[PDB]
């Protein structure tokens, strides 16, 4: 309780601008791609013998779910 907040702001980038920086070198800021490119009978005995834009209401979801529930 009361440690569970909906964030209702954000950390302003201006708030950390007057800080004095440190100078640790990061593994993802080493030189890489230094160059820039440029553009220029027997059948008779039987009694019976003769995209909708919603994902859950589709046929893909129904074939998935009819496969995985057995």
């Amino acid at each position: 309780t009361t440690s569970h907040r909906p964030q209702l702001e954000a950390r302003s980038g201006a708030k950390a601008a007057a800080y004095t920086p440190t100078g640790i070198e990061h593994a993802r800021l080493l030189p890489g791609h230094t160059t820039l490119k440029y553009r220029k009978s027997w059948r008779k005995g039987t009694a019976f013998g003769r995209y909708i834009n919603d994902m859950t209401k589709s046929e893909y979801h129904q074939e998935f779910l009819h496969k995985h529930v057995r």
């Binding site: 601008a17 007057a18 004095t20 440190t22 100078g23 070198e25 030189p31 230094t34």
Partner: protein, 137 residues
């Protein structure tokens, strides 16, 4: 009008020079020795007249450089006197309060009143009753 072909060039050159000065300073303050192969390349008069010669010093490679540098937390005084005006011009939307049946964070006791055929059926059963009477006959 569109801005003329000369002002595009003057603006591009002046701002390109500024961005290159900032990039050279950021690559020259780094601890990587490899960054200084990517940079692309005094006297001042202290009074009415004194003629000094500003020289730099050669520092020890092992002792820390920028010995004042440190990680600090700073607040900035937001200071202005430009007042700027806000130049504007000159029952249906009441949203009810939210009562949920899952969560009750402050643990209140909300009012208990608040929280909480087709014809084919008949035709099928009619045909089955007719089938029953037919089989008995």
């Amino acid at each position: 009008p569109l801005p003329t072909k000369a002002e595009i060039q003057e603006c591009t050159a002046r701002t390109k020079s500024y961005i290159q000065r900032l990039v050279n300073a950021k690559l020259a303050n780094s601890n990587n020795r490899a960054s200084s192969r990517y940079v692309t390349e005094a006297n001042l008069l202290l009074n009415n007249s004194h003629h000094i010669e500003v020289v730099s010093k050669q520092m020890d490679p092992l002792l820390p450089r920028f010995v004042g540098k440190k990680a600090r937390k700073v607040v900035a005084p937001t200071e202005n006197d430009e007042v700027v005006p806000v130049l504007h011009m000159d029952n249906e939307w009441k949203i009810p309060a939210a009562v949920s049946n899952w969560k009750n964070p402050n643990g209140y006791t909300v009012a208990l009143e608040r929280r909480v055929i087709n014809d084919g059926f008949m035709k099928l059963s009619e045909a089955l009753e007719n089938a029953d009477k037919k089989a008995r006959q």
